[PDB]
């Protein structure tokens, strides 16, 4: 299961205002104490 999940999460990254794309995935995977483009949503 782990290897399949890793491959399924990595393939879209290879295929591919607010940071998005590969940098966002790298930030999410890392601890990312400092946020390049921090955001908050309130309703």
């Amino acid at each position: 299961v782990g290897v399949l999940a890793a491959q399924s999460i990595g393939e879209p990254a290879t295929q591919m205002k607010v940071t998005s794309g590969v940098p966002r995935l790298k930030e999410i995977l890392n601890v990312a104490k400092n946020m390049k483009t921090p955001s908050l949503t309130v309703y």
Binding site: V3, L4, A6, Q7
Partner: protein, 94 residues
Amino acid sequence: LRFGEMERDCMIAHGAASFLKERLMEASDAFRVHICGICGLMTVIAKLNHNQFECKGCDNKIDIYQIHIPYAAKLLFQELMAMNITPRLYTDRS
């Protein structure tokens, strides 16, 4: 050819453990090494022609088991031993 890490994990996902074992132990470098059942160190004197087994490190006569591993594994074990690190290969779970 080189069996890359990406291919290794892809085959692991495929679940073909037998294929990986054959590829990394039969289609690649293959070695057979002797280890004692008490010290678990590859430094075992084994004369196959005379069928005489004895390890200088531990006072044992017949406690030797043979294991098939790639030459790279024993090379890494020897390198670690040079660093005063001893991978104690045991055939049983404590």
